[PDB]
Every structure is written in structure tokens, then in C-alpha cells.
Ligand binder design. Structure first.
Ligand SMILES: Nc1ncnc2c1ncn2[C@@H]1O[C@H](COP(=O)(O)OP(=O)(O)O)[C@@H](O)[C@H]1O
Ligand SMILES: [Mg+2]
Ligand SMILES: [Mg+2]
Ligand SMILES: [Mg+2]
Length: 1284
């Protein structure tokens, strides 16, 4: 199709079927349930190409080919009613941004913009007008899409509007009322004294303020940006208080400044790391090399609570996206490493899986449900982390919604407005920690995405394009990788308020002013007013300052990465802010910074204390047996697989300890651990402590417990000095709600002025979200969150190899409980209470500070001395859950006695006091108990019993059996929540298969079989000569796992060279100079138009580069490796590779979900030179992909491929048999195929990541006797030897 579209032409290209069978049956079932007589539904992707010039026959064929991708699903002739779903007019999908990028990189400049929709064909010849609109409703997201009746209506998506002029607010001609009107019209939310400020400011200037100036001011002065509460003076119960909340947090730094390099003066904090080999490509040579130097650690944690309540996916995605920008913009440039995620929502009320404690209290129509948030939110956060390229290694997920008698009496307390938390750590160079000085005349730049009207219901719908941020990170990396020559003088993230906040922030921080040109800013929507361009909160943008003479270098760096950037201003000596508009020949902004950034009076909060009395727990319906079952069914306690495997946990190749633990990969790791470099055992650790419900009874206790839990979760890691542990404190509260204000102050004081200073813990970073409540009319109703402090702990690790997990051993052992509760056994605000719809009387709390410090120190002593077999702290679910989860991870039984824990067995098993259980060798029990005694924990330590081979979970009290059950049964109950979530979000068959496998106790877990000596470095003789063959580490825009690949080849004796597609196109690199090449993993073009397709087709359509690749593959002795995205790319290049005619395609996983797994595979017989000597071996490997499913044209193709003997790797279950059952086989590949080679064996492509686990320490689970090298190191060594 091709028709006029304004000054352009719009082509309509038919796409492939968009919905698989189960997705269609889910739609049909959804229709039936709603009384909509739908007989059948079919869907097809439809593409729209807005062209600024004609395409010749060749160009047309190329575009049509670019738009041919995805699973080869059953195609049908359209029938029924057409309902086209597309992005809403005035919006541009991220798909469009990346798809259009691909077209341009294939030399199709005529393509102004590509967009995609979904054509639904509905057969239901008996529906009415309202019914059809209800059908329409079920087929699209009302907050992001719209429905059209004709394909031609897509033209509305490309309308170009003329630029809207600035608008002045008539203060001089109307008086104060002009500002009052504007405050309402523009939704400025200005306070009365802020209007007063503005009125005087502009009356003094003698001119009307432009809407843009008022908007910029409003955003910078919102509670979100100014933090008025955290800086206000306080009067509590009549007594003025000396410190503000922020000053009390800073008190922790004043008391403990140890190891802190940067705090409260950047978008993240920085603490000392370790001197290790920072690995990266040299600017001059392009070769990857180790640079022995300090790799310091940055940390930051943020939230996106409001956005997520409106549009979960984007809300969570940009929650991570924004925090990642904070990290990279630290100092003069830094690199994100790992991340963490947090969620707090109300009851899920899963259809058909309702729990006894859940009650529908209703909710506002304008927000989404808790279930929707936990369905779309995690996928959005994972989408950004996966596509950008940072592993998500730790987090929390709590559900809470109950009518309780708290501080303000009987009310509904919960999370209709959720907590969406995203944070992480990164590494930074010593010389880049401090911001540089901004020289007068410095060029002011916007690095990143174009401006769109996203900042401002619909105003809270965000947009994420992780690939754009990835391109930006590559630039930042080039900059800091230049060390002393780093062009970045100052960098800052673009967040709330958009450029209107970020740019003034930047020049102000540097003590300068700035003059800007509105028309220099990159924009993708011409109709925007100056206010919209300047104030929108579009994503993936950074602002920085570079010296004029460094512009050429900076330009070089951006062009090579294809990272958009624009110089939009100049720093000035005069501290004034000017924004000119060349199009309207005027000045939207003309203000002195002292006026714009001037502050209205400081806030004073005069409040009083409200303290709930608490009520004894009613045990009428409670029994220990029923409590176990209920508690294991509380999402907060239950298995979190649905939140873990959806996120990459291996990218960077520096992940030592991820959430999944042991042979059975059970997600119960208490903290995350990464190595500091690809050549060290030093590292970093992240943990989270949180206990919001307790705040409904005791504010201070809830805060102390959050700190305490972060500590107990990280305790079994080798850190040493407790002062190495640094905290991020994120405070969520419903400020203004009765009692919450005084509670917040008491809570901050409890940790900032008392607990942390005494323990020696610094809180160098943090944030606050102060409107955690939701109101609406149910026929007024209110859902108010408990004060919610989330503590994230970060620390330098001394030896990542000594970390302990909950995986119990069955060798002669002793289980010892460390009860920091000192026998209090509090049950108030516990999972137990919650599961019985109660809050209880008294909650847990830090009972003895000295003993908590002693606990930590003792654990550190035990960890360093290698005296522990396992560790698991107590938190949600109490001792019962701790022991249960340990049995789950150890796939064994437990025989414990609790007679010494009090006569109240319910309280003993379910209290959530601090502490945990350590497992030690039986012969070390006395020595360990003696060590603990030396730290003053004698009467807190209790011998419980031992772990035993088997399936029995037994708890006794003298001759009495308190509770006894099949560990497997408990394990399955504990898994029902993730099972149900996976069943409603992914392919039901897959969800069922994974859940059901958990019920088979005979599962031996991951296990190895080796056909060769893993420690024999067959490449050593070659490396010893000093001759190092080069290997082209190929990458394209969006690709995120190249450093780790280079490191693997590097250890094998190769000189790894960074080869960007831009280098090949530019003639800077030629494949004729290489004998080996490797296509890397990552998300080239964000997998848009099919994973690996844009990369491959950009090569195919650029004949010069195409010829280069073909030539390489046709040489007699060249070797090529394609991993993950590289595997997909090469599979789409078959026409250039000899002996590849039988290769399959790689498409969307059968589960229809991204799979981050540690999968078991077997090396099969094939000509592959890279798998030489490894045939018959069985070992786990890193898997991280959403489109790794081998797809053939027909069985004839599959049979031919098999008979030719080209299959090199197959997924096998733990029993060792080839399998297609999920998740043993994570993507559903036929015959378990996941790697194939060519007839001559010189080229091999595989979906798993061998390079991510070549270091034994980077294997989630591995045999205890392994050395530094895992079996996968042999692939790289084989490559080296093969070249000779
Ligand atoms: N939202 C989440 N995203 C990623 N991982 C999570 C999330 N929530 C929990 N996890 C992980 O699941 C495992 C168990 O979670 P949880 O029981 O809440 O931890 P704990 O009680 O030890 O503090 C941990 O390894 C944790 O890091
Ligand atoms: Mg838990
Ligand atoms: Mg824990
Ligand atoms: Mg926790």
C-alpha cells in the first residue's frame, strides 16, 4: 500500500501473524466471560512507512525484507471486523525509534519514520454498538494506544504540526489573578507563597512571565524536586527539634565518613573499591586490555511510585532507566554494573487463587490493580535492565492491604499507589569522582534521545527506549576510558522537569549561567511549544559540559556509537539563564539564576505523636499446620521466580552470587555479589532490608529492623569492617496523614541519630516519596501506606568465593539459631498476623545494638575462617520459613527441636525478630558456639538439630511433634504464587511444566559430566610464544556484552579488538586482517524487526561490508563464533556463510518470556572445531534470551539438519536426557538444539553465553572441586590452538 500523507507518502506493509494459539485462546476466553459472542479472532502486524522520497525497486525490496520477521505462525486470510490497534496519535513508539534507525542504517534515508500496529480480525456477527466498543477495550491499552477502523487511519500518526509559540501570562494586565489562573490551567500546584514570590519577581523585572518560565519554576519547586519535607524545621509534641530529616541522615556521614569518596553532592554516592584490572578497549588501538587501578563503587536507589500506578510497564522501565542515568552521570562519567528491584503493592487477588486474608476494598478507576502492576511492572523493569545490559541481582516484593487499627484508628492500609524501587552499583575511576570545573564558554550538550511531549492521567504515562540509553553509555564509557583526556567536565542526568531543571542545575552547580538556543535541541515533534520542548520529561537524555576544543573528539565518539547529541548552549560567567528561539526570533526565558532558583521560606511542620496501642493476636482460627500453609502462600514470603528469571543475571560476566541458589536453582540468596573486575576475587555486594507493616505499630522499630535486615541479609559475605557497609535510605510515607509525620521524624532519628551511628553505618545516599496514599469514591475511601523505609546495603567484598548461601549440606552437621530477638518472640505485624487478617500487639525490633554489631562481627569471623556450611537469616515468615527455604535449597530434610525457644511454639516459629540459622560441620559446633560466646551472643544461640538427606521437615519440642511434613509438599505450596503468576502472564504450558517438576523429589539438580581435563590449558604452548592472534569482537548499536566476550578470548591468548559496525563501514577496520571473528550478545537495535535482523540486514544491504563478511567466511582457515545476539545475527547471514544452508532461525521462546537461566546442556558430536574434545560433556551454562527458539521450515528441514550432523549443543534435563520440557529447555527448541556449526566446522553459533561463565566463580552453581577455569574456557582455548 502507498498513499499521500501530507507532504509525504505513507506505505502500508502487511506483517506476520502476531498472536500465538494460547494468546488467542486467552482472548476468546476473556470474551466469553464478558458475554461477548466472539467466534474467532486473528491478528496480524501491520507496518507504516512515512516516506519523504520514493523508493526504487531495490530499495522497496529491501524495506519489505526488513519488515519480514518473527515466529512463522499460521497465516490466515482476513475475515470479520477489522480493529486496528496503534500507538495513540501524538506519540511515537520506541519500536518506531529503533525500526526507523535500522532503515536509516540500511541506507534508506527516504524512510522518515516507521511505525507498527496490530490488525485484529474479529468474527462475531451478533454484537451491538456497546459490545463492539467493549471488544475494542479488551484489545488495547487505553493509556498508550487507540483503535482505528481503517488502515488508512494510521495517517493520523504522522501529522506534522506547526510549532506553537510561547505564551505569556498577563500579570501586568490582570494582576495576581493571572498567576492564579495559570496555576490552575497549567496545573502548576503552586503554594500561595510561591505565587507571591513569582508576583514580586516579575513585577520587579517589569515584564510578564512566559508560561515556560512559570512551568520550569513549578517543577523545580515541587515536593518531588525540592524535598521541602526533608529540609523543614520540626516541632513535635510542642518541642522544636534541632535537626531536619536530611541533617539527621547526614549525621551518619559526620559520624562515619570512613571509605566515602562522595556523598550528598552528586546523583549517587561513591565509596572506595579495590585495585583491580579495569578491562576496556584503548581509544588508539581498539584493543581490549586490563588497566590495574582502583575500581571505586557508586550506588543509588530511586523510585517511580506514581507513574507505575498509572502505566506499570513504562513506569517501572523508566524507574530503572532514570536510576541508570544517575549512575553513569556520577562524577565525570561512570559505568553501571548491577541492579536491584523492589515492589510493594496491595493484595493480588489472583483469579481462582484467592487467599483467606484478601478482601476487595475497591480502588480508583484511574489506577491499575496490584495484579496488573505485578504483571507488567516487573517486565518493564526487566525490559530496561535486559536491553540496557545490567544484571538484576537482588530485590524484594511485598503485598499488603488490610483494614487495621493503627495510629489513626481503624483504616485501610496498603499500596494502591505502589512502591516501585530501582537501584544498583557501578564502578568509577578515582580521577572522575569529583565534578570538573565548568569553564566560561564551555559547550552545553544534550546527549541522548530526541524530545517528545512526555513530561507534560496521560501525563504519567512514561516511555522507555533502553537501546538509546545503551548507545549513550557507550559514549560515556569512551569518555571515562580516556582517563586524563576525558572530555566530560560535568555530566548530569535528565529527569524530573526535563531540561528546564537539568540544565539550570548543571550550570548552577558549576557556578555559571547559560545561554541556550531552543532550536538546537533534538526534537521529534515540531508542534511542541517552547514550554513543552524545555519541560518535557522524555527519557534517555543526559546534559554535559565540554570545552570547545574537545568538541571534535566528542563528536567522533558519538558518531562511532551512533549516539545522538547536540550542542544547545554555552556556559557564561554571568549567572543568568537565557533561552533563545531562532524560529520565532524571541527569548522564551530571560532570568537571573538567583531569581529562578530563589527559595521561598523554609517549611515548618508542627505535628504530634499518634501511637497505636496494638491488640493481642486472636488465635481462634490458628494452628501451626494451617499457619505454615498460609504463610507459604503470602506473596511476600512465597517463591519469587516470576520476578527473577525475567531479568538477566549474567551480563558483564562479573556475577558471582545471584538470587538462584544451588543445583535446584532455588531463589533464596540473601544478597547479591559481583566481582570487581574480570580478573579478581574482590567484589561488591548488595542487600535489602525492609519491614513496612511494623510501622503500623511502631515507626522507629520498623526503621531499625530495615537496617538490621539489610545487615543480616549481607552477613554471610566476606566484607570485614562493618564500616565498609554503606546504606541508601529511601523513605516512603503519606505525609499529612495523621501520625505519619511524627512517625517519619522518629523513624529517621532512630536510624540517623541513633542506630547507624552506634553500629558505624553511613547513609551517604537516599531519597523520599511523600504522598503514599490513594483516595476515591467507592459509592470517600482511602488506602494509606504504612511508613515504608527500604534500606539497601552496599559493600566492598574481600573475597567473593567465600560467600555462603542457604543451600544446606547433608554431611555431618549442626544447625544453630542466632536469636537476636533474645526470646521476645514478637508476633505483631508479622506474616503470621497478616495471613489471619490481623496486625497484632507488639512487633519485633532491634533488641540489643551491641549484640547486633557482635552478630555481624562474629559472622565475618566465621566467614573468613571458612567455618560455615550455609546461612539464611530470619525475616518474613520467621524461623519456619528460614528453615524451610534452607531445606528447599539443599533439597533435603530438617530435624529440629525448639523446646529451648519458649513454650509458645507459634511465637517461636513465626516471630520475625532479627537473626538466622547457620549450618556448621558437626565437628565445629563447640568451637563455633565458643566464638559466638566471645561476641556476647551465648544466650541468643540455640542448637536446633541437623539437616538430613531425605524429604522430611520435622520440628519437635521434647517428645512432642510440633509440626511434620513432606519438604517437597512445603516446597510446592511455596511455589504456587509464582506458578500462578507465570500461568497468567506467560505460556500456561510452560508455567505448569516448571511448577510440576518441583514436585519430583528425585530431581538430582544440576550435575556435571566431563569428557576432558578442565584444568589443562591446551593453549599455553601458544600463549608462551608471545604471538597473539587478533579476534574481531563485533558489535552494533544496542549490543551490550562485548567486554566480557573479549575477556574470554583474552585469557585464551587473543588480542581482542573492539570492532563496531561503524568501524567497518568507515574503513577503520577490515576483516581481511583477522583470522578469527565473534559476533556478541546484547540487544542490537533492541531486537526490533527480529533479534539480530537489523544487524544482519544492515550488513547485507551495505554491499561493501557484505562483501567483506562473505570474503572472510570463504577463506580456508578463518574461524567465526556467534553467541546469542551474534548467533541470531549470523543465522540471518547464511547466504554469506559456506555450509550453512541447513541452519534454523531463532525466534520468540515458547514461553513467550525472556529467560535468564542457568541451563544444563550436553556437547554433541559435530564438526565444530571450537567444541573439540568436549563431546559428551554435560555442564550448566548461562542463558539470557527471549528469542532463542530454534525454528525450522518443516520437519524435512529439521531432519536434514540433524542427519547432516551439525547440532553441537542440546539442552538436557537434570536426569541427563535431551529435552523440550520447560525450563530445562528454556526456549522450546526442537530436540533441545541450541548450537549448530557448519559442514567444515569453522563457524559455530550458539544461544547460551559461554563467555559469561568461563570463570568458575561466575557460575551460579558449580562442583566444589573446580579451579579458576570452568569447562567453557576450553572453547576459547580451542580457537587459539586451531589458529596455531
Ligand atoms: N522484585 C524482585 N526482583 C528481583 N528479585 C527479587 C525481587 N524480590 C525478591 N527477589 C529475590 O528473591 C529472593 C527471595 O526474596 P525475599 O524472600 O524477599 O528475600 P529475603 O526475605 O531474604 O530478604 C532473593 O534472592 C531476592 O533478591
Ligand atoms: Mg523471604
Ligand atoms: Mg533473607
Ligand atoms: Mg527482606
Amino acid at each position: 500500500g502507498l498513499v499521500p500523507r501530507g507532504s509525504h507518502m505513507m506505505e502500508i506493509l502487511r506483517g506476520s501473524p502476531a498472536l500465538s494459539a494460547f494468546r488467542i485462546n486467552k482472548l476468546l476466553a476473556r470474551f466469553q466471560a464478558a458475554n461477548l459472542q466472539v467466534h474467532n479472532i486473528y491478528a496480524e502486524y501491520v507496518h507504516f512507512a512515512d516516506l519523504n522520497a520514493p523508493l526504487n525497486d531495490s530499495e522497496q525490496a529491501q524495506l519489505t525484507r526488513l519488515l519480514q520477521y518473527g515466529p512463522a505462525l499460521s497465516s490466515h486470510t482476513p475475515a470479520g471486523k477489522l480493529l486496528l490497534v496503534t500507538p495513540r496519535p501524538g506519540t511515537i513508539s520506541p519500536w518506531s525509534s529503533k525500526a526507523t534507525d535500522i532503515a536509516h542504517n540500511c541506507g534508506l534515508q527516504q524512510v522518515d519514520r516507521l511505525e507498527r500496529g496490530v490488525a485484529y480480525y474479529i468474527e462475531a456477527s451478533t454484537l451491538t454498538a456497546e459490545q463492539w466498543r467493549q471488544v475494542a477495550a479488551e484489545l488495547h491499552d487505553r493509556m498508550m494506544e487507540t483503535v482505528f477502523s481503517s488502515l488508512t487511519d494510521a495517517e493520523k500518526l504522522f501529522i506534522h504540526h506547526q510549532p506553537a509559540p510561547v505564551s505569556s501570562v498577563d500579570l501586568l494586565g490582570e494582576g495576581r489573578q493571572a498567576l492564579i489562573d495559570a496555576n490552575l490551567r497549567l496545573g502548576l500546584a503552586l503554594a500561595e507563597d510561591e505565587i507571591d514570590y513569582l508576583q514580586e519577581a516579575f513585577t520587579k523585572l517589569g515584564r510578564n512571565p512566559n508560561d515556560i518560565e512559570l512551568y520550569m519554576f513549578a517543577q523545580a519547586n515541587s515536593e518531588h524536586c525540592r524535598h521541602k519535607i526533608f529540609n523543614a524545621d520540626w516541632i513535635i509534641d510542642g518541642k522544636p527539634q534541632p535537626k531536619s530529616l536530611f541533617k539527621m541522615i547526614k549525621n551518619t556521614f559526620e559520624t562515619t565518613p570512613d571509605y566515602v569518596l562522595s556523598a550528598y553532592k552528586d546523583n549517587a554516592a561513591v565509596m572506595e573499591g579495590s585495585a583491580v584490572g579495569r578491562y576496556f578497549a584503548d581509544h588508539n588501538t581498539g584493543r581490549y586490555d586490563f588497566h590495574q587501578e582502583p575500581a571505586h563503587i557508586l550506588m543509588k536507589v530511586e523510585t517511580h511510585n506514581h507513574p507505575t500506578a498509572i502505566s506499570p510497564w513504562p513506569g517501572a522501565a523508566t524507574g530503572s532507566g532514570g536510576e541508570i542515568r544517575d549512575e553513569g552521570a556520577t562524577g565525570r562519567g561512570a559505568k553501571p554494573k548491577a541492579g536491584l528491584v523492589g515492589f510493594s503493592v496491595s493484595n493480588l487477588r489472583i483469579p481462582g487463587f484467592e487467599q483467606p486474608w484478601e478482601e476487595d476494598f475497591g480502588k480508583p478507576e484511574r489506577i491499575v490493580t496490584a495484579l496488573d502492576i505485578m504483571t507488567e511492572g516487573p517486565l518493564g523493569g526487566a525490559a530496561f535492565n535486559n536491553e540496557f545490559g545490567r544484571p538484576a541481582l537482588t530485590g524484594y516484593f511485598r503485598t499488603y492491604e488490610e483494614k487495621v487499627n493503627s495510629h489513626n484508628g481503624e483504616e485501610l492500609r496498603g499500596y494502591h499507589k505502589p512502591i516501585m524501587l530501582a537501584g544498583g552499583i557501578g564502578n568509577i575511576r578515582a580521577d572522575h569522582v569529583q565534578k570538573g570545573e565548568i569553564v566560561v564558554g564551555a559547550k552545553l550538550i544534550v546527549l541522548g534521545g530526541p524530545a517528545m511531549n512526555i513530561g507534560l492521567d496521560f501525563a504519567s504515562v512514561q516511555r522507555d527506549n533502553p537501546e538509546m540509553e545503551r548507545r549513550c553509555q557507550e559514549v560515556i564509557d569512551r569518555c571515562w576510558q580516556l582517563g586524563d583526556a576525558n572530555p566530560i567536565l560535568f555530566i548530569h542526568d535528565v529527569g524530573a522537569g526535563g531540561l528546564s531543571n537539568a540544565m539550570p542545575e548543571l550550570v548552577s552547580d558549576g557556578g555559571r549561567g547559560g545561554k541556550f538556543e531552543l532550536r538546537d535541541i533534538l526534537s521529534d515533534e515540531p508542534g511542541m511549544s517552547p514550554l513543552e520542548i524545555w519541560c518535557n520529561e522524555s527519557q534517555e537524555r543526559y546534559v554535559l559540559a565540554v570545552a570547545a576544543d574537545q568538541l571534535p573528539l566528542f563528536d567522533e565518539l558519538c558518531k562511532r556509537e551512533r549516539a545522538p547529541y547536540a550542542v544547545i548552549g554555552d556556559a557564561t560567567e554571568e549567572q543568568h539563564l537565557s533561552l533563545h528561539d531562532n524560529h520565532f526570533d524571541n527569548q522564551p526565558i530571560d532570568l537571573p539564576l538567583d531569581v529562578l532558583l530563589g527559595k521561598t521560606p523554609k517549611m515548618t511542620r508542627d505535628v504530634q505523636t499518634l501511637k497505636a496501642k496494638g491488640d493481642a493476636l486472636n488465635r481462634a482460627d490458628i494452628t501451626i499446620a494451617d499457619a505454615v500453609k498460609r504463610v507459604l502462600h503470602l506473596p511476600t514470603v512465597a517463591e519469587k521466580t516470576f520476578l527473577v528469571t525475567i531479568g538477566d543475571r549474567t551480563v558483564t560476566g562479573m556475577v558471582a552470587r545471584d538470587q538462584m541458589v544451588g543445583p535446584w536453582q532455588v531463589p533464596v540468596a540473601d544478597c547479591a555479589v559481583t566481582t570487581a573486575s574480570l580478573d579478581s576475587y574482590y567484589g561488591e555486594a548488595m542487600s535489602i532490608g525492609e519491614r513496612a507493616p511494623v510501622a503500623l505499630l511502631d515507626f522507629a522499630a520498623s526503621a531499625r529492623l530495615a537496617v538490621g535486615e539489610a545487615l543480616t541479609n549481607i552477613a554471610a559475605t566476606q566484607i570485614g569492617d562493618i564500616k565498609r557497609i554503606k546504606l541508601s535510605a529511601n523513605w516512603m510515607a503519606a505525609a499529612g496523614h495523621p501520625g505519619e509525620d511524627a512517625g517519619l521524624y522518629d523513624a529517621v532519628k532512630a536510624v540517623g541519630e541513633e542506630l547507624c551511628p552506634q553500629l558505624g553505618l553511613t547513609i551517604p545516599v537516599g531519597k523520599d516519596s511523600m504522598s503514599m496514599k490513594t483516595r476515591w469514591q467507592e459509592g470517600q475511601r482511602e488506602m494509606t501506606s504504612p511508613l515504608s523505609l527500604v534500606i539497601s546495603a552496599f559493600a566492598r567484598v574481600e573475597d567473593v568465593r567465600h560467600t555462603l548461601t542457604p543451600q544446606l549440606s547433608t554431611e555431618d552437621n549442626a544447625l544453630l539459631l542466632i536469636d537476636l530477638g533474645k526470646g521476645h518472640n514478637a508476633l505483631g505485624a508479622t506474616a503470621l498476623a497478616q495471613v489471619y487478617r490481623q496486625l497484632g500487639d507488639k512487633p519485633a525490633d532491634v533488641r540489643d545494638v551491641a549484640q547486633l554489631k557482635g552478630f555481624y562481627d562474629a559472622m565475618q569471623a566465621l566467614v573468613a575462617a571458612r567455618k560455615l556450611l550455609a546461612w539464611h537469616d530470619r525475616s518474613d515468615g520467621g524461623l519456619l520459613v528460614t528453615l524451610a527455604e534452607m531445606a528447599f535449597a539443599g533439597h533435603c530434610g530438617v530435624q529440629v527441636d525448639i523446646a529451648a525457644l519458649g513454650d509458645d511454639h507459634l511465637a517461636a516459629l513465626f516471630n520475625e525478630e532479627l537473626g538466622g540459622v547457620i549450618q556448621v560441620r558437626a565437628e565445629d559446633r563447640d568451637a563455633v558456639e565458643a566464638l559466638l560466646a566471645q561476641y556476647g551472643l551465648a544466650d541468643c544461640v540455640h542448637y536446633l538439630g541437623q539437616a538430613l538427606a531425605g524429604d522430611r521437615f520435622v520440628i519437635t519440642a521434647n517428645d512432642q511433634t510440633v509440626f511434620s511434613e513432606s519438604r517437597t509438599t512445603l516446597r510446592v505450596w511455596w511455589a504456587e504464587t509464582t506458578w500462578q503468576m507465570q500461568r497468567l502472564r506467560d505460556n500456561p504450558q510452560c508455567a505448569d511444566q516448571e511448577h510440576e517438576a518441583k514436585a519430583n523429589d528425585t530431581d538430582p539438580g544440576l550435575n556435571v559430566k566431563l569428557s576432558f581435563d578442565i584444568n589443562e590449558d591446551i593453549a599455553a604452548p601458544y600463549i608462551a610464544t608471545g604471538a597473539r592472534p587478533k579476534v574481531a569482537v563485533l558489535r552494533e548499536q544496542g549490543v551490550n556484552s562485548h567486554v566480557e566476550m573479549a575477556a574470554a578470548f583474552h585469557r585464551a591468548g587473543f588480542d581482542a579488538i573492539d570492532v563496531h559496525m561503524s568501524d567497518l563501514l568507515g574503513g577503520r577496520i577490515g576483516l581481511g586482517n583477522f583470522h578469527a571473528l565473534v559476533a556478541c550478545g546484547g540487544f542490537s537495535y533492541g531486537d526490533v524487526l527480529g533479534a539480530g535482523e537489523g544487524w544482519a540486514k544492515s550488513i547485507l544491504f551495505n554491499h561493501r561490508v557484505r562483501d567483506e563478511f562473505e570474503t572472510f567466511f570463504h577463506r580456508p582457515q578463518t574461524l567465526a563464533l556467534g553467541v546469542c545476539n551474534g548467533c541470531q545475527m549470523m543465522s540471518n547471514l547464511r547466504e554469506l556463510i559456506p555450509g550453512s544452508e541447513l541452519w534454523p532461525r531463532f525466534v520468540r521462546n515458547h514461553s513467550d518470556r525472556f529467560e535468564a537461566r542457568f541451563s544444563l546442556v550436553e556437547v554433541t558430536q559435530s564438526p565444530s572445531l571450537l567444541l573439540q574434545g568436549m563431546v559428551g560433556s554435560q555442564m550448566p551454562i548461562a542463558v539470557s534470551h527471549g528469542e532463542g527458539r530454534v525454528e525450522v521450515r518443516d520437519d524435512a528441514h529439521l531432519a536434514a539438519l540433524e542427519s547432516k550432523g551439525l547440532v553441537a549443543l542440546r539442552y538436557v534435563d537434570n536426569f541427563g536426557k535431551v529435552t523440550e520440557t520447560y525450563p530445562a529447555n528454556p526456549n522450546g527448541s526442537p530436540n533441545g538444539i541450541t548450537a549448530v556449526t557448519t559442514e567444515n566446522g569453522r563457524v559455530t553459533i550458539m544461544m547460551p553465553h559461554p563467555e559469561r561463565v568461563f570463570r568458575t566463580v561466575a557460575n551460579s552453581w558449580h562442583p566444589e572441586n573446580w579451579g579458576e577455569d570452568s569447562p567453557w574456557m576450553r572453547i576459547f582455548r580451542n580457537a587459539r590452538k586451531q589458529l596455531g
